[PDB]
Design a protein around this ligand. Sequence first.
Ligand SMILES: O=P(O)(O)OC[C@H]1O[C@H](OP(=O)(O)OP(=O)(O)O)[C@H](O)[C@@H]1O
Ligand SMILES: O=P(O)(O)OC[C@H]1O[C@H](OP(=O)(O)OP(=O)(O)O)[C@H](O)[C@@H]1O
Ligand SMILES: Nc1cc(F)ccc1C(=O)O
Ligand SMILES: Nc1cc(F)ccc1C(=O)O
Ligand SMILES: Nc1cc(F)ccc1C(=O)O
Ligand SMILES: Nc1cc(F)ccc1C(=O)O
Ligand SMILES: [Mg+2]
Ligand SMILES: [Mg+2]
Ligand SMILES: [Mg+2]
Ligand SMILES: [Mg+2]
Lengths: 347, 349
Amino acid sequence: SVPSWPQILGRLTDNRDLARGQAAWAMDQIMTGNARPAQIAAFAVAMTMKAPTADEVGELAGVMLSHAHPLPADTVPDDAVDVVGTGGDGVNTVNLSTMAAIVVAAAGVPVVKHGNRAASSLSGGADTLEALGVRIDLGPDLVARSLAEVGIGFCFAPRFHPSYRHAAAVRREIGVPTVFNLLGPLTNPARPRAGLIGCAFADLAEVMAGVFAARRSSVLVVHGDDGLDELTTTTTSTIWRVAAGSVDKLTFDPAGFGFARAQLDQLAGGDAQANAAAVRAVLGGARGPVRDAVVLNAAGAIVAHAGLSSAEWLPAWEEGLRRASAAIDTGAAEQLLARWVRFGRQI
Amino acid sequence: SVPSWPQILGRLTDNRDLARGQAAWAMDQIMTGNARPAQIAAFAVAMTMKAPTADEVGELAGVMLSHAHPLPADTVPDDAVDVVGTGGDGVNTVNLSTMAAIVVAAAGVPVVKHGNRAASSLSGGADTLEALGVRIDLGPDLVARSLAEVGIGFCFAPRFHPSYRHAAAVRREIGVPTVFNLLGPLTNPARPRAGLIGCAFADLAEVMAGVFAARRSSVLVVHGDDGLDELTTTTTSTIWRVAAGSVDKLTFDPAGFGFARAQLDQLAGGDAQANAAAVRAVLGGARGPVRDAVVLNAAGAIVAHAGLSSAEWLPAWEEGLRRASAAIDTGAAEQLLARWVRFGRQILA
Ligand SMILES: O=P(O)(O)OC[C@H]1O[C@H](OP(=O)(O)OP(=O)(O)O)[C@H](O)[C@@H]1O
Ligand SMILES: O=P(O)(O)OC[C@H]1O[C@H](OP(=O)(O)OP(=O)(O)O)[C@H](O)[C@@H]1O
Ligand SMILES: Nc1cc(F)ccc1C(=O)O
Ligand SMILES: Nc1cc(F)ccc1C(=O)O
Ligand SMILES: Nc1cc(F)ccc1C(=O)O
Ligand SMILES: Nc1cc(F)ccc1C(=O)O
Ligand SMILES: [Mg+2]
Ligand SMILES: [Mg+2]
Ligand SMILES: [Mg+2]
Ligand SMILES: [Mg+2]
């Protein structure tokens, strides 16, 4: 009837789902600086061990978005796409989402990407972008301009979600992954309706998918069956395909499209300078396992985009793979990155 | 190794028992002021939802005890007993543990009682003792003197465990019961080897028993089947009997000894002043439900004390009840409270 920490924490430690509105109450306390770090941590942990539901995580993400800096009215195309994951997969890979995102934009799909620096890897998508000379410090107006002028824009989470600072501090202090690790990908401030969304935690991917389902997004939530928060080339992947308010879970195998099985070590990354070099290599046309993984993920995002103004599954994949490879082979992706760097320098 | 929060918290969220030493490392961070409040709360919650083991809780309590103020050497009798519970049973009662402790002491069993103010109740043992004029603020030397000159001493937890203050603050901030609620009963700084220990939560009583078993204490861990963290008179109780380093679970029925079934409402308490009046009535010999409950719990403690030197179960109880009754009816219990109060008043001058 009246919410409070003991009531909500007690319900969670009792292994019970929250009543409607309780998760939202907790999140709003956290976003307004009213929650003690101890209360934030207890909530994050207790929700994780109970097993959060889509409705609960929908409340968390929705409260968080309510405090975000939005983009200006009518600056995001109806069919814009995001490509991003939770991170936290524990494998030091090159920046597959960030590379796929450039390829997708170069293929002519508008991209508004959310992301952040590394949390447990050597270089995150934002670190790599920065090393490439792309501006990761742009606010709402300049991101809208990047999107209009370059066909791609990057929303740096800390710049768009300043009120999340209390929760983010607690995440860093406790270290262990929680339900909070789901929130970045769920809270793109430009609110695109399509996306390729990676989840490192197989048990929570269905929940992320359920959240997108209630937004009527066209999304592929993906988890490599080797643990990657990306579509993998080393084995199969699980995909939770979200459209028209529902979810269609399936096992995806890239060998069906003629991809050779790679080993994880072939996808290995390093620091920002190293991963930036790996981007240039791929966009320059270097063949091999890294390109293969980039093309696979880029095609996945194109399939998500196709889901908006809606091709069937297989033909969409065939076309996504054609467009992704062509965006690299024709130099369009290399050219678009150069254009993105110039845009940032002309500010 | 090497231990860290991500490692230990990750193991707990994966629903795994900790490795040997991890709980102790976490408690060391907590007790030295090196744990952030977020880390303390994450640990408390994660350990609770995983379900703590007796080994894990034993590590927490042992580290905690290593930072406590000890009583001076050779001041605690070999056969000293505690009577105390977790609290948090959410039933408004008179202070049954504190009353029983006075009666037990007056029966000639040395009592070194650990306790604290109310957390959720209207008056805790410490609050009620304060209302009776008993000094709750004494350090190790004076508690030892109290035990010698009066036959009972009270260890006020915040006085003896100052390094637990960061953990205590987090407990209050989150409000929800955790594994940390088990620590008061497990960390009596006088380390008596026998006790009557109340549990508000049946699911964790076995863990509490296990920690006492590892110490080879003689203890009855108790939970009333009506929810009380005391031996109840309204219905049966569950007892985990700790003896000879092992635990066994029992259902206990006070009707077997001639106790009438009381109603929970008959044991209702009030503020410290009211609960102090209830202590006085019982020690003056008033008959009824409150006396019955005190006598039962006092006998329980005397049974635990007896277990320090092998007495069958039923005779032990018979003698326990008789001893508790006599301590009241001879005037000894009322006289002991008076001596205790007098002792505290002697401290000035
Ligand atoms: O350090 P970690 O916790 O494992 O996270 C690695 C990266 O994954 C996420 O973004 P994104 O998917 O955009 O990065 P990517 O290009 O490396 O896939 C996250 O924002 C990090 O930047
Ligand atoms: O407010 P609560 O969280 O419910 O706890 C009630 C009381 O019970 C415990 O002590 P003890 O068993 O010594 O007190 P008692 O005499 O009241 O039984 C605790 O130290 C509190 O003083
Ligand atoms: N304020 C933030 C918002 C995010 F989405 C992620 C991190 C932070 C931060 O303050 O570190
Ligand atoms: N993992 C993330 C993904 C995003 F898109 C934005 C922020 C984060 C983060 O975890 O801080
Ligand atoms: N310091 C303490 C020790 C205890 F055992 C219980 C509570 C406190 C406190 O600081 O409140
Ligand atoms: N419940 C307790 C029992 C004790 F003996 C000491 C401290 C407490 C407490 O919960 O602070
Ligand atoms: Mg990624
Ligand atoms: Mg990744
Ligand atoms: Mg008690
Ligand atoms: Mg009680």
